[PDB]
């Protein structure tokens, strides 16, 4: 629960990185420091937020797919004229 603020931050960072809008800032800084040790600020918070945002939108393993691919013999004159003349006859 203590990290739920930055959890909301990260869940918003999905898709687009959205954006980052005082006591809660101290709370989240202490929470991250406990997750670390070293001193921090909102700058590394946002760098880590970016790491997570990009990681989310990073591609993952996929499966295959039947890819479509949109693609000499010439009819001679005698058959063409047969089929033209028959429909000429059928005309009224």
């Amino acid at each position: 629960e203590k990290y739920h603020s930055l959890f909301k931050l990260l869940e918003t960072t999905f898709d687009d990185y959205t954006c980052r809008p005082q006591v809660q800032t101290d709370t989240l800084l202490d929470a991250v420091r406990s997750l670390l040790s070293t001193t921090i600020d909102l700058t590394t918070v946002d760098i880590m937020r970016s790491s997570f945002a990009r990681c989310f939108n990073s591609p993952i393993m996929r499966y295959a797919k039947i890819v479509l691919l949109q693609n000499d013999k010439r009819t001679t004159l005698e058959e063409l004229l047969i089929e033209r003349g028959e429909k000429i006859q059928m005309l009224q």
Partner: protein, 222 residues
């Protein structure tokens, strides 16, 4: 390629070069439009045929149905004979006798070929795995990517079942014209259909209208 027309009495000549690329483009556009048209016509005739097979209930559940097998056998005969007529416009009738068997499980569903044929020493039997083909038709379709009520999805369903019965009919043709030994090797190797059909059918195919591949096929084989 270039053509010249000039005044016979005068040295004046007005030469116009004609570009084969534009003509090739126009032929290609006309051919693709005609192919689209004729395939749509064959499909429309096929849907009309299955309509004249007298089933109000639609195809997907015309397969989902378990008890209903008389209509299953009738429609399967209709599709295979329609394909026979397509490759044989003269033919409008098939063998006097036919039998159908309704497989309904994995141990009876041979992968890749749910539909197949083998004799009972008197007549050929249409083995059919209703579960496999039903799940085949039950898959949602990308009918979006790039006054009888019909839908684009139902058009995909018709194209699906037609291609399935068409491949089954190619195997059946191998059977009839070359014995069960050729039947089984063609099943084991469909490259043999090239050799068998260049002899007969090339002398065409709806599927030949397109070339299909599998993404990353090279590395999937690896």
């Amino acid at each position: 390629v270039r053509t010249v027309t000039e005044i016979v009495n005068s040295d004046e000549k007005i030469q116009k070069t004609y570009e084969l690329a534009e003509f090739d483009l126009k032929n290609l556009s006309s051919l693709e439009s005609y192919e689209t048209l004729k395939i749509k016509l064959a499909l429309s005739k096929y849907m009309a045929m299955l309509s004249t097979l007298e089933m109000t209930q639609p195809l997907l559940e015309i397969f989902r149905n378990k008890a209903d097998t008389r209509q299953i056998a009738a429609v399967v005969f209709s599709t295979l004979a329609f394909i026979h007529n397509r490759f044989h416009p003269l033919v409008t009738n098939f063998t006097n006798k036919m039998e159908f068997v309704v497989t309904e499980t994995n141990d009876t569903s041979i992968p890749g070929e749910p539909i197949l044929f083998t004799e009972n020493e008197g007549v050929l039997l249409c083995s059919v795995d209703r579960p496999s083909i039903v799940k085949m038709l039950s898959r949602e379709f990308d009918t979006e990517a790039l006054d009888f009520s019909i839908t684009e999805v139902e058009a995909t369903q018709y194209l699906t079942l037609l291609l399935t019965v068409e491949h089954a009919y190619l195997h059946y043709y191998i059977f009839k014209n070359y014995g069960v030994f050729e039947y089984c090797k063609s099943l084991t190797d469909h490259s043999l259909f090239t050799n068998k059909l260049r002899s007969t059918m090339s002398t065409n195919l709806l599927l030949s209208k397109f070339k299909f591949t599998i993404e990353d096929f090279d590395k999937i084989n690896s």
